[PDB]
A paper describes a structure:
The voltage sensors close the channel at hyperpolarizing membrane voltages, while PIP2 is required for the channel to open.
In contrast to the down structure, the intermediate structure largely preserves the secondary structure of the up conformation but displays a ~4 Å downward displacement of the loop connecting S4 to the S4–S5 linker. The intermediate structure places R6 and H5 below the gating charge transfer center; R4 in the gating charge transfer center; and Q3, R2, and R1 above the gating charge transfer center.
Author numbering:
A (entry chain F), B (entry chain D), C (entry chain H), D (entry chain B): 6 to 149
E (entry chain E), F (entry chain C), G (entry chain G), H (entry chain A): 104 to 218, 223 to 396, 506 to 568
Amino acid sequence: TEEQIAEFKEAFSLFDKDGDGTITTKELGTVMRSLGQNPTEAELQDMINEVDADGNGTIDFPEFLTMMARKMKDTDSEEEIREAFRVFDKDGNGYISAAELRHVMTNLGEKLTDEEVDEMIREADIDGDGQVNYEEFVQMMTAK
Amino acid sequence: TEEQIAEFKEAFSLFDKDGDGTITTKELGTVMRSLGQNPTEAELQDMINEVDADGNGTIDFPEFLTMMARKMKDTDSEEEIREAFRVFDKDGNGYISAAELRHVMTNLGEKLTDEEVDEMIREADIDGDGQVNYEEFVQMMTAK
Amino acid sequence: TEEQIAEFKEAFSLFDKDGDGTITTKELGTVMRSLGQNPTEAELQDMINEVDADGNGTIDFPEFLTMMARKMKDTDSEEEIREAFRVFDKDGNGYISAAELRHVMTNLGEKLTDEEVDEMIREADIDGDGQVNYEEFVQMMTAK
Amino acid sequence: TEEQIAEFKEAFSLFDKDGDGTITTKELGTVMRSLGQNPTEAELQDMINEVDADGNGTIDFPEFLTMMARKMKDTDSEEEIREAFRVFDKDGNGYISAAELRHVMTNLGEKLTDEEVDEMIREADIDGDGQVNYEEFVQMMTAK
Amino acid sequence: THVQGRVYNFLERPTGWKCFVYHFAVFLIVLVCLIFSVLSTIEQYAALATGTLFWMEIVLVVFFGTEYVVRLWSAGCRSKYVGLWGRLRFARKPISIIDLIVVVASMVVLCVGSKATSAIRGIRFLQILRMLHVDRQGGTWRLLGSVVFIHRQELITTLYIGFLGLIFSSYFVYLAEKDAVNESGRVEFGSYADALWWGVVTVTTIGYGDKVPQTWVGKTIASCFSVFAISFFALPAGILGSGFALKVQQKQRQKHFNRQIPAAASLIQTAWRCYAAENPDSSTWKIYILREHHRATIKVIRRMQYFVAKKKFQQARKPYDVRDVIEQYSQGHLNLMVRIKELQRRLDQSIG
Amino acid sequence: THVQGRVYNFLERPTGWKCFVYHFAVFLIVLVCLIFSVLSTIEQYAALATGTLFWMEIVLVVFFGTEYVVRLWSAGCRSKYVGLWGRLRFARKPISIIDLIVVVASMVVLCVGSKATSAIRGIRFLQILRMLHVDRQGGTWRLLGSVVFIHRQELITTLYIGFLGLIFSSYFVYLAEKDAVNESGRVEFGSYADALWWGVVTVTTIGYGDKVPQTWVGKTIASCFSVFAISFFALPAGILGSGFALKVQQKQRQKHFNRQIPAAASLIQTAWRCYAAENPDSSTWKIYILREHHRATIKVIRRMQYFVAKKKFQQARKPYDVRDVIEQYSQGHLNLMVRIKELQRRLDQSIG
Amino acid sequence: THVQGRVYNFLERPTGWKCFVYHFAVFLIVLVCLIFSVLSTIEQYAALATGTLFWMEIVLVVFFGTEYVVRLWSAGCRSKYVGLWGRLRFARKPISIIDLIVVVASMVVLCVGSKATSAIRGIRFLQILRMLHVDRQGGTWRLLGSVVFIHRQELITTLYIGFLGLIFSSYFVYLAEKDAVNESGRVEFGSYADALWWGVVTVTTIGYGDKVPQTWVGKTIASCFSVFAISFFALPAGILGSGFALKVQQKQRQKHFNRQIPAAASLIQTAWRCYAAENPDSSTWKIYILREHHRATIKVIRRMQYFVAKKKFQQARKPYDVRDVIEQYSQGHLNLMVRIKELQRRLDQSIG
Amino acid sequence: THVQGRVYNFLERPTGWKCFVYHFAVFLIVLVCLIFSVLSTIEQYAALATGTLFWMEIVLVVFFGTEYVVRLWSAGCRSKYVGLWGRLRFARKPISIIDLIVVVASMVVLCVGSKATSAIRGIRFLQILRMLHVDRQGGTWRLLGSVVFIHRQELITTLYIGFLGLIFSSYFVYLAEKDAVNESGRVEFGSYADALWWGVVTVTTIGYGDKVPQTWVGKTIASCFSVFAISFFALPAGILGSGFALKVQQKQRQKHFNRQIPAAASLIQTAWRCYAAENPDSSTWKIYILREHHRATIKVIRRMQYFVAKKKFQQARKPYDVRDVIEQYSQGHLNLMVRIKELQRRLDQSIG
Ligand SMILES: [Ca+2]
Ligand SMILES: [Ca+2]
Ligand SMILES: [Ca+2]
Ligand SMILES: [Ca+2]
Ligand SMILES: [Ca+2]
Ligand SMILES: [Ca+2]
Ligand SMILES: [Ca+2]
Ligand SMILES: [Ca+2]
């Protein structure tokens, strides 16, 4: 929609903060370290290699529109998220325990804070039975 | 022709400027930086790997004659140039717009000056319709 | 067994000596250099890549239990040890000499001391005939 | 022969000059630089990777005997030397000119001195016709 | 506590040796019953087998009915098959529909018979159709479907060439042998229908010989057709054999299951964070640490983290190739360039 | 504005589901008409189909004529097919020539018939020939031609071996069975023509049996021939199946379409600069900045830039391999050698 | 000193040219005797061959008995075949059991005959069974078993599809041709037994023609069956040919035999050290140098060294791949990071 | 000056378009003469072709005689074929021997005939034998020999399995059908000779049907034999097709011809230096610069240089693989370790 295009326009302008019309890894790292995100060249290349579809190594306005034309509710999206829940399902019988989920969240990734760990155990719980109904969890991830 | 051989002879002598009979990446970089072409070892290896057909890593007189025995009007040449115009033809319907050509020229390559951008839009234009007749453009590239 | 689990528990605690619950290459190198084992990052990565089954790069208690659940008397174990004795059997006729074994032990590996070389030539010897009965040697490696 | 074994023995002793019984890249480089051969680690690894058949990275006496058990008059040897003369035979008609041989010898390899270039043009010449009889040249390489 | 999972493993997915041998015994006894029913029509076992058909039929239908009932009851272990809706989803599967159709047809025919040849043949059909139930991982049908899906354009092209070649060859055969009469006076090629039948026989190399050209030109064109189009007839066997061989070759280059665990966890975390970006009153915003217009920036950061996690997930599912080496070398070279530049700047500052 | 492009996409290159199903329906109705015409000669549909042949014939010829006309009119979208010369170039294509020949033959036969068996057979021939029009990307003919071109020497060698083997085997069969008489007195091998026919039948495994050797030596030599030469007969199927399998395997290692965009742009720029090197009065010479004899040097620089761009283009079209890793490692090692040498020189200067 | 090894090499594992030609001569004379016995029943050699059967039989049985005796005596060279128990282990091998059974059956039949057709046929059976003794490295049976073991699920799937397809096709053929009567009044398809026989003939492309459908629908369904299921019939040849081709392709990427010697020696040393960890009174504990509770730590160190040696052994047996390059690059990058960090720390300390 | 080379290129190794079309015309006219001679025996061309056989025979023998003479004369261009000994070496080649035998047989038969069927057949044999002369690069015979040599053990194993399987299957067929009588009273399986013939027909899928089992057990064992052993019959086609496919796949990874020039030159120089090490009075010893016992050291240095050059030559002939990357990374890492160690030592000296 036109309003969505305008929103992407001011988002691009704010993320640029330079007026050149192209946004670089230097500027992205600068804004993250202003926020305090201690960036890395690994993050910079993980950004360049996929979003920058033109291939010039920068972030142009038409490029940004192309990557904002994405959609997270794709059939491929819920299929891959379901397979991801199947990745750590060691038993393979459709039974998933909350203890292993808590351990993985705490010891891997961003090292989830106890607040968001409690958020995990409260949102994904059928009356706190320990066996989360991950299909409806996938549905309400996709529903957003 | 004999005159062509002589022309290649003085071209080799001028590009050498040393009298050793062999021309190296050091001398090529020196002459480019005298012209002001801020060379790079990447350019030096991109030169060595293809022209230096003998494989000794230098530029000898018989080598230079072998690489000047080239011809840019080869059937393979216009075939590959036509495929190259097909590379960025996103639509694939034979329609090419001048706006994308201008954007690519300005934002990629040598960062074409506005003068040569105007040269592009004036030479490749059927009365300025925006749909260049790229087949005749290929023909008059090959015709030189 | 429960006693075996307890033994693994105090072994993990002693090898940690930090109380964090996870043991790192830094601590392992520190304890080895306290023993005097002049460690190397090659040894550290050769440790991480195989024992650390979780993949977090450390030594956790459940991980340590998983790697202590091993067994050295496996059919694959004696098969691979028999193939290993077949590796340096140059003749391939089932005849193995003690001289080559002594030379290999002295000039390769940990550079076996004369004491353990004598241990080799006395344990693996059918009345000192020079032709060791390597099948029973494999059996009493596996029997432990 | 026993005399050949003894010759290899004193050759090994002279090339060692240390008495350890094993000869290393350090000692080989030292003796070459005493001769004045300005060695390189590339030469050292090109030596280790092929002669050192045991794989310990040094030059032991049994190893040296194994590599001196070679023979340069092997059928594979003259076959590969004939193919090597076929490698630079650009025409492929069995005709080889002495001018290209002289140019290759002078501009590649050890940069053959004019003395050995004259040796080339005098030994390999059927009355100085310029078309060397390379089959008999191969035969008298193999005959030694 | 785990009785439902245990019975589900015992029934749906046998493994090890106990359940594997049990399922093998069931399969072999089913095949023995099928072959005995095949031999029943022959006069050797015309009477005894037919008399014993009803007993084995009722025993088998009872066994498969109980098996279907217990499998449906144990289907509740799967999260997607929990409740009445989940049981319906399990039943709506093609295999479950096949099983219920087979058992209902069996009970219908048995109750009608209790109080002919077509009924018995339908019994064999439902037995061999239920025999397909042993396929549990889809290793036959799903595998062949995937193989076809990979090579759709190739099979389309090959079939197109084969049909066109056989059609032209049959037309040439007919025009050469319009008046084809074999020995002792029979018109073998009565029409191009006969020509097409001879062509398909030749391409399948049956060689029945009921329609064989009797002219030299016909023999030559038949030889040319055999040279050209029989290769099309032999294609798919070699094609899918090579496909299986290359799949097995690539089966040796998969990363260990623990390598994709960090990528899966990271993508789950990023997906949850993107979903929770719609919750303004969350308390996780200050963990990164006043904040009024930075919510959009945080949403963009979470979105790009989710995209990076998606890239990591696609990288995890694919085997090793040159791209991993290229990117590893690129990141190492960039790191060492950066470190050398920092050292150069610091040394230039220090020297003065 | 885009109506010509839209109709060109609808007709020439169907995609998605609407046009794809439309073209599938057209193809299936064409095949149904073809099979009904095939069944027409049989007495089941001798009268009704023949009576209805003219109606379907005129309807189809009108449909294909309109389709050809609209496709030719829409061909003007392509730049190479603009104007009368472009329309002629479109018509000079083999597919366009085939279509126009088919439609003109159809209208000729229909107008002659309006005011026999051969005419109807030619109608079927033109229908199946126009049926080849569905090939639009050349995925059948161009693909098979490319596959043959890749393996020309291999097919030449294999065919050479096969023909020589079958020729010697047939000669041995004839010399063994010059007086071959089967049961009840027929000379099956009347000549080496019969021997050659038996040999081709054996290598194609038809097994008609009209000429079968009756001697033990003949049986042994026939067995040897079957062992040796039938493999030649079975070659091409497996050969091109393996070729397709390896092509599909290599289909996973192509760079993204945006990676070759910089190379294409650079080569276009270098080509234009080389062409414009012939224009002395250009104003782009001073952009690099007095200049009298440096025009030749600038021409050489542009030529070497064009050669480098050509190398980049050839690199873009080929998939990943060891060469890319080798050159990347070489450039990185050279860069770090250069940087370390610069650091060493600067430090030696600084220490004094 | 080495006479037992020499005779073992001469008998069990011929190599070079002398023993190789000797074994080839033995094999060819055995085959000549077999083919002469095959020709014996024919009247050309009915009398002379039968009269000479006993002489060659006794000579051969004596030769193979002496060969078996000398091979069993020379089996003592192998360490696992030392002593009476080792001789029994050698005899318990399937090949040794086959040889002893063959020789005992031969001597039994010869002594019974000395003082009919079935006996002679059993003689041929034991001769061709002993003929299998030439397989010494298992290159036939062990290789085929390994190839099957690698592709067990693939052959299971392919066979499953093939049998199901042929079963349904045969049922369709029977239902189409229940009343199948060919020319001059014979019921070719008397039952679905005949239908199954015709189906297996078609899938094997024998084309005997004793049961050929006479209806158009039968011909169409037979053509569909030939298109679908004959590929299954042709699968295994191409499958294992591709397997052999890929094995030979991978045969070029093995490390030299001296490369695994250090890994083997290290794993032997670690295994011995782990075994000796149970010996508290050993004198090797102080070599690493007071020690009371460190025995468990030393045991853990030896265990992890043994695990690392096992990893090295598994790496040695596998050919080169991307993993080796990845780990080499990782270790080099880690080393140079560590060295650069040390240099940075030392320079920061020095500058002050 | 180059007339001998030009005629050698024109005759032995045609290339381009002129000589290529000339040789193609010669080959096609030879094939036309062969097929006309094949058709000569048939009564259509019984008289005219036979009357014209002598004219074409003498013309062709004169043409091939002149061609052989000029080729032998032009063979002197090759260095190994210089002089009478070189001409004999050229003549001793199998192709030259074949050509001279063919021409001498042709002139003998023509002079005898001038002043029967077997002679004409021998004429065809020598024509098709001389037809093999078009093979000049050995692309058929040498290629097949190399392919066999690569897979000797694989073909040995496969053939062994195939013959054993067919032998046991034929024995089972005979024991099942000892009294095999087909319809209307003929003993189809009169013996295991008939059983072997039926087995080879089945494995080759000829399906003549002269010996078809009439029992159910015979049909089952024949089906098992067809399932097992026909794959062996189909092996070699797929095996060598996969071999050709992998060879073509590896044809894309060869280094340019100029890359092996330095290795060849270095190995030639080292070989000459090793040969000249036997010449004490040479003047090249002082180029490296008093020298009494260093001659042995110089010989060892030259020998190790020759070995290194041999390693470079073996590396040049093999395509790219992981070993090149491994050694390049190893040398780069060693260089940068050495440089960093030198820098560390110099900095430690400087800081004091
Ligand atoms: Ca903007
Ligand atoms: Ca910045
Ligand atoms: Ca010059
Ligand atoms: Ca310079
Ligand atoms: Ca603890
Ligand atoms: Ca520490
Ligand atoms: Ca010594
Ligand atoms: Ca030194």
